[PDB]
């Protein structure tokens, strides 16, 4: 539980696209070299009130949250404490960070998970189950659905070099974990693209938040 | 005459001024119509002065009481003499001088 | 001359544009190591007081302001027994560990 | 019958920055001292745990003299005169005005870190008004499990039924310290050793001990096992439970050992319910 | 025939702040003074232990002249005139009026801290803001196991049968006067060395020794073992019980040593029962 | 005369100069008509001096106090004597000297 920490920063600035994974990751790596080589690090989605043009308006509860092992914080704290970064032509500022624990919950949820070479929902469930066994985890797999009930896919736009690649993923809800296995899931996660702002798992209330709108 | 006696007298005055400072402190601390404890404070001071077991004991107390007294001009005038007198001399004679000061501050008020 | 040579030779090997507050906070970490060492050993204050004051001033003035290379950084890393290469190249963990080992502190960052 | 409930409860592994000291020049040093084998161990003040218990009591009804504002951070007295007959807080923890000066039923000892405190300083930058300046300071943290000892003079309580909320509060202890608890460190126990006896003599004060900082298994001290096996600590008076029971049940000769006949439960809530049944039987509740 | 029971008793390891001297300005100074090898050791007043034993006699029924109110924190006399024939308290502990003035059957020595005392002063706060003169307070504590020496003149007892409740109280000693709210130190013995003989010459004085400073070994002094081996301190009159028994049995050639002929019991209650049987035999109870 | 008393007096002067520097710092910190906290600062200094548990405690404290005092000219001329005196002598004696020094700063201003 407390053996892993979620670094939270009060984030303020211009409104941000809702598929801003690579943008914020690249900006952070620009203002933090060691972030580009760490392994067990991941970033929580940035909350807020969205807009009509697929952009998110940052609010008071909007904050940049980073999942990290407690034995690697001193490699990231110098480059982010009070620091500011630019996403394109927009200015973003981070305050003094605060530490939040990894709490267990009965059910978990992930906004976007991607595993290479899996586009259909059924094989995605099978692959998430395979990674699920690889971690010694027990639970049941469900996919978050749209208003239509269709499983909801989310897309990440990595704008590497001149080109840009498309990676599509699903929202995965897993329940009945038992708190120890729940903590293992939130800390490991599924998908691997945790630096890419996808694989972090969260308690199940945010799943309802995303399913309402 | 006999500069040691001069140092002893100025030490008596220093201790008197320190107790004056502590009296001002306790008078500031008390509130409402309650009688400010002065006789109680003097008896407490005498009892703690009698209670002592050599060197560190009662010398720590002497220094702490002088600090509690605050600004004291007589000690300001003569630094090295009083500092050496406190560091040197058997502690019992310093106790004698301090108790005599207890009884010799009352001239001030 | 060796510090300046290390400074020139290290820039192409960083692989990025240095961040000013990275250097500022490395200087602050060295200042904290110096303060802990002084806390452990009082004599080191005589050897490091001027550099302590200079580093404190450099950490109180605006961080975006550049630091005088030969006047400040080279003597600072010299007294810290740390090469300019080590100061500008190693991460915060390695720098902290080497500083603690150099001043025989028991800290672990 | 003069009944007493002593116990050593152990918390879960995690980071701790709870009860920082005078903060000599820049580091919020963790409260440390000397312990077994002469190695430095980090401590948590028992008064902090008592304050946490009082806050828990104030949270769930339980009329209490000292109300925590949670906004202005000011304790307000519901009544000027202390009345332990009506208030849970005055009845349990006592008071001192300087009236009645209640002795207080609950007694506590400071929590001692299972593993010695070696290193683990953390980088903390505090802000500054000097043109948006950030000065780096240090903060000590410790990754360990805190065990502490407590005793309840059940007969001393003005209302005998007030013991029951206390065990719940120990099980559901709120955040200790609050603002200075940098990493949110839970103090809900993960393994309990309870002795509900009727005589003043009390062992099991600090039964939990593992040492070997490389791991966090939180074994049981050989001294406590020997004391149980010898004949002291009547097994019918011994309540044991938590993750430590999982380790104990795997041990060889456990069935033959006198530790088996001691009241033992894998789940902590089973302990709490069975023990509370025992208390309500013994206190005529 | 005159009979004397002498005993050196060692308490359990823990954090203790039992006795305080003068309260310099903010610290409650632990009662400390020089001891063996010329380093400062903390002390526990023998008067506190006598008060604890008297309170024990009060709690478990019995007749006592001084009654501890536990609510007014005042001492009440059942009769203004003392009577050692009836009350256990006046017979055992004696009394001075300033009549008979007695002598007191129980004689005890001050409790020394096995472990030397270096530092370890506790911090103290009171909520937040609106801080008054009582906001800041320090408190000293020592992590050690206290050890005290007692001897009783059984023949001096008005009733010879009163010796058994005294030993029972020494076993189940209640709280010893100290800051038990934040420092709950159990004073129940964990090692005993008793001598039941008919001579005034009483050795078996402070013998428990610390193998390592700042630790909790508590081995037995080499001088005491040498005294036992040399011929003095008849093993048939020696009564050893407690945690020290394991260490004694792990000593080499223990069987050949005269110590093995002494009455040793790893369990404390078994040794207490055997001692009380012997005492009842030798007093015709 | 009596060189150890010379060391004691120069320690007194060093402590006084360091607390002069600290007083100048806190006077600089405050602004506008509020009375700068100095008697309160003296009380805090005394209380922190009283709070100590031998050796490392109060020695890190004295070193930190000397550092926060600033540049000490007397310490600059007397590095070796002051350092040797601090390393040796019982810490209670050094605390007593420091408390004297406390009570002794006033003639400076």
Angle at E181 between CA E180 and CA E184, to 5 degrees: 40
The answer, yes or no, to whether E and C have at least 3 beta-carbon pairs within 8 Å is: no
Please, which residues bridge with residue D239 across strands? Answer: D194, D263
Tokens 């548990």 -> residue: F53
CB C108 within 8 A of CB C100: yes
Q: Is E132 exposed, middle or buried (0-12, 13-18, 19+ CB in 10 A)?
A: exposed
Distances (CA, A) of E156 to B3, C52, E109, E163, E164: 64, 73, 18, 11, 14
CB D171 within 8 A of CB D268: yes
Q: Tell me the chain F residues in contact with residue B56 when contact means C-beta distances shorter than 8 Å.
A: 90, 92-93, 96
Our CA-based measurement puts residue D10 at a distance from the nearest CA of chain E, in whole angstroms, of 16
Look up residue F88 and give its two tokens.
């040796």
- Residue D184's closest chain A neighbor by CA? A101
Tell if the CB–CB gap between D132 and A81 is shorter than 8 Å: no
Taking only residues 178 to 217 of chain E, the set having a beta carbon closer than 8 angstroms to any beta carbon of chain D reads: 180-186, 188, 190, 212-216
Could you write out the DSSP letters of every residue in chain E? ---EEEEEEE---EEE---B----SSEE-B-EEE-GGG-EEEEE-HHHHHHHHHHHHHHSS---SEEE-SSS--EEES-SS--TTT-HHHHHH-----------SEEE-PEEESS-----EEP---SSSS--TTS--EEE-EEE-EEEEEEEEGGG-SSGGGHHHHHHHHHT----SS-TTT-------SEEEEEEES-S-----S-EE-SSTTS---EE-HHHHHHHHHT-S-GGGEEEEETHHHHHHTSTTTTTSGGGGSEEESSHHHHHHHHHHHHHHHHT-
- Give E191's contacts (C-beta < 8 A, 6+ positions apart): E9, E10, E208, E218, E241, E242, E243, E244, E245
Q: Say yes or no: C97 contacts chain D, CB-CB below 8 A.
A: no
Q: Say yes or no: E118 contacts chain F, CB-CB below 8 A.
A: yes
Tell if the CB–CB gap between A74 and C96 is shorter than 8 Å: yes
Comparing C-alpha atoms, which of A174, A93, A186, A116 is closest to residue A140?
A: A174
CA distance A200 to A206: 12
Nearest to A1 among D12, D125, D127 (CB): D12
Tell if the CB–CB gap between A74 and D122 is shorter than 8 Å: yes
- Tell me the backbone φ, ψ of residue D10, rounded to 5 degrees: -120, 140
- Give F21's contacts (C-beta < 8 A, 6+ positions apart): F68, F69, F70, F71, F72
Tell if the CB–CB gap between D136 and C25 is shorter than 8 Å: yes
Q: Say yes or no: D138 contacts chain C, CB-CB below 8 A.
A: yes
Q: Say yes or no: D178 contacts chain A, CB-CB below 8 A.
A: no
Tell if the CB–CB gap between E22 and B48 is shorter than 8 Å: yes
Q: Say yes or no: C56 contacts chain D, CB-CB below 8 A.
A: no
Q: Say yes or no: D22 contacts chain F, CB-CB below 8 A.
A: yes
Residue B7: its H or E element: helix B3-29
Nearest to D123 among C35, C39, C109 (CB): C109
CA distance B80 to B73: 14
CA distance D35 to F30: 44
Comparing C-alpha atoms, which of C71, C67, C85, C83 is closest to residue C27?
A: C67
Comparing C-alpha atoms, which of A170, A176, A166, A30 is closest to residue A92?
A: A30
Maximum pairwise Cα distance, chain F: 48
How many residues belong to chain A?
213
- Tell me the backbone φ, ψ of residue C11, rounded to 5 degrees: -55, -50
Q: Say yes or no: E25 contacts chain B, CB-CB below 8 A.
A: yes
CA distance C88 to C11: 9
CB D127 within 8 A of CB C54: no
Tell if the CB–CB gap between B64 and F50 is shorter than 8 Å: yes
Look up residue A9 and give its two tokens.
């920063």
Nearest to E22 among B29, B51, B64 (CB): B51
Neighbours of E118 (CB within 10 A): 17
Q: Tell me the chain E residues in contact with residue D50 when contact means C-beta distances shorter than 8 Å.
A: 181-182
DSSP state of D72: S
Q: Tell me the chain B residues in contact with residue E22 when contact means C-beta distances shorter than 8 Å.
A: 48, 51
Nearest to F47 among E26, E118, E120 (CB): E26
Taking only residues 224 to 283 of chain E, the set having a beta carbon closer than 8 angstroms to any beta carbon of chain D reads: 243, 246, 266-270
Q: Say yes or no: C94 contacts chain A, CB-CB below 8 A.
A: no
Half-sphere exposure at residue A155, Cβ-oriented, CA atoms within 13 angstroms: 7
- Residue A74's closest chain D neighbor by CA? D123
Name the experiment that determined this structure: cryo-EM
Nearest to D127 among A3, A5, A82 (CB): A82
CB E33 within 8 A of CB E43: yes
Residue D207: its H or E element: none
Could you write out the DSSP letters of every residue in B45-98? HHHHHH---STHHHHHHHHHHHHHH---HHHHH-HHHHHHHHHSS-HHHHHHHH
- Residue D132's closest chain A neighbor by CA? A82
Comparing C-alpha atoms, which of C86, C84, C90, C91 is closest to residue C6?
A: C84
The structure was resolved to a resolution in Å of 3.2
Q: Tell me the chain F residues in contact with residue E118 when contact means C-beta distances shorter than 8 Å.
A: 53-54
List the subunits that have 3+ CB pairs under 8 angstroms with C: A, D, F
Q: Helix, strand or coil for residue D144?
A: strand
Our CA-based measurement puts residue E42 at a distance from the nearest CA of chain F, in whole angstroms, of 14
Angle at D90 between CA D89 and CA D96, to 5 degrees: 130
CB E29 within 8 A of CB E23: yes
């Amino acid at each position: 539980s407390e053996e892993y920490v979620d670094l939270t920063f009060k984030l303020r600035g211009a409104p941000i696209p809702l598929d801003n994974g690579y943008l914020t990751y690249a900006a952070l790596s620009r203002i933090c070299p060691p972030l580009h080589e760490l392994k067990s690090i991941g970033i929580h989605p940035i909350a807020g009130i969205p807009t009509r043009n697929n952009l998110l308006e940052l609010t008071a509860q909007s904050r940049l949250k980073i999942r990290i092992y407690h034995q690697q914080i001193p490699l990231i704290y110098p480059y982010l404490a009070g620091q500011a970064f630019h996403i394109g032509q927009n200015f973003y500022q981070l305050d003094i960070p605060d530490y939040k624990p990894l709490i267990s919950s009965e059910s978990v949820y992930s906004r976007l998970v991607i595993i290479k070479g899996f586009q259909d929902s059924t094989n995605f469930i099978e692959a998430v189950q395979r990674q699920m066994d690889n971690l010694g985890i027990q639970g049941k797999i469900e996919l978050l659905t749209r208003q239509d009930g269709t499983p909801q896919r989310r897309q990440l736009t990595i704008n590497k070099e001149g080109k840009q690649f498309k990676v599509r993923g699903f929202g995965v809800k897993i329940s009945e974990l038992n708190p120890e296995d729940s903590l293992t899931l939130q800390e490991q996660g599924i998908g691997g693209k945790r630096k890419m702002m996808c694989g972090i798992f969260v308690p199940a209330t945010r799943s309802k938040e995303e399913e309402e709108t | 005459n006999s500069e040691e006696d001069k140092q002893y007298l100025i030490f008596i005055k220093v201790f008197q001024q320190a107790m004056k400072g502590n009296f001002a402190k306790i008078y500031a601390k008390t509130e409402e119509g309650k009688d400010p404890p002065i006789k109680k404070k003097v008896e407490r001071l005498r009892a703690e002065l009698n209670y002592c077991y050599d060197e560190l004991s009662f010398k720590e107390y002497l220094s702490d009481f002088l600090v509690r007294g605050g600004l004291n001009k007589y000690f300001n005038e003569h630094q090295e003499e009083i500092a050496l007198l406190i560091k040197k001399s058997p502690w019992q004679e310093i106790r004698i001088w301090s108790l005599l000061a207890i009884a010799s501050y009352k001239p001030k008020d | 001359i060796q510090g300046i040579s290390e400074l020139i030779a290290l820039t192409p090997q960083l692989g990025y544009k240095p961040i000013p507050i990275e250097l500022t906070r490395k200087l602050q970490l060295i200042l904290l190591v110096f303060e802990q060492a002084i806390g452990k050993d009082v004599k080191l204050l005589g050897d490091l007081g001027g550099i302590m004051e200079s580093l404190r001033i450099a950490s109180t003035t605006n961080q975006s302001q550049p630091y005088h290379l030969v006047k400040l950084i080279i003597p600072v890393c010299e007294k810290a027994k740390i090469s300019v290469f080590q100061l500008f190249g190693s991460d915060f963990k390695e720098l902290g560990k080497i500083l603690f080992g150099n001043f025989s502190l028991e800290l672990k960052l | 019958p003069n009944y007493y409930l002593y116990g050593t409860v152990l918390t879960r592994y995690g980071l701790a920055s709870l009860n920082h000291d005078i903060r000599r020049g820049n580091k919020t040093i963790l409260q440390k001292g000397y312990w077994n084998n002469g190695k430095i161990h980090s401590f948590v003040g028992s008064s902090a745990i008592r304050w946490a218990l009082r806050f828990y009591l104030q949270k769930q009804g339980y009329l209490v003299n000292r109300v925590w504002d949670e906004e202005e951070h000011i304790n307000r007295l519901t009544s000027e005169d202390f009345d332990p007959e009506k208030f849970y807080d005055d009845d349990i923890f006592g008071f001192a005005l300087l009236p009645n000066q209640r002795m207080g039923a609950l007694g506590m000892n400071m929590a001692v870190s299972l593993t010695p405190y070696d290193g683990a300083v953390k980088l903390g930058a505090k802000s500054g008004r000097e043109k948006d300046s950030t000065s780096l300071h240090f903060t000590e943290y410790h990754a360990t499990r805190y065990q502490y000892y407590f005793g309840i003079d059940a007969t001393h309580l003005k209302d005998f039924s007030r013991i029951l909320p206390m065990i719940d509060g120990i099980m559901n202890l709120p955040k200790v310290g609050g603002s200075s608890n940098i990493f949110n460190y839970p103090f809900c126990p993960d393994s309990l050793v309870f002795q509900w006896t009727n005589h003043f003599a009390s062992y099991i004060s600090y039964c939990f001990e593992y040492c070997d900082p490389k791991s966090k298994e939180a074994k049981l001290s050989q001294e406590f096992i020997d004391e149980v096996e010898c004949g002291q600590i009547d097994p019918s008076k011994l309540w044991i439970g938590g993750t430590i029971v999982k380790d104990l049940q795997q041990l060889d000769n456990f069935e033959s050992s006198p530790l088996n006949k001691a009241h033992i439960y894998r789940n902590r809530n089973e302990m709490i319910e069975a023990l509370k049944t025992v208390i309500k039987r013994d206190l005529g509740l």
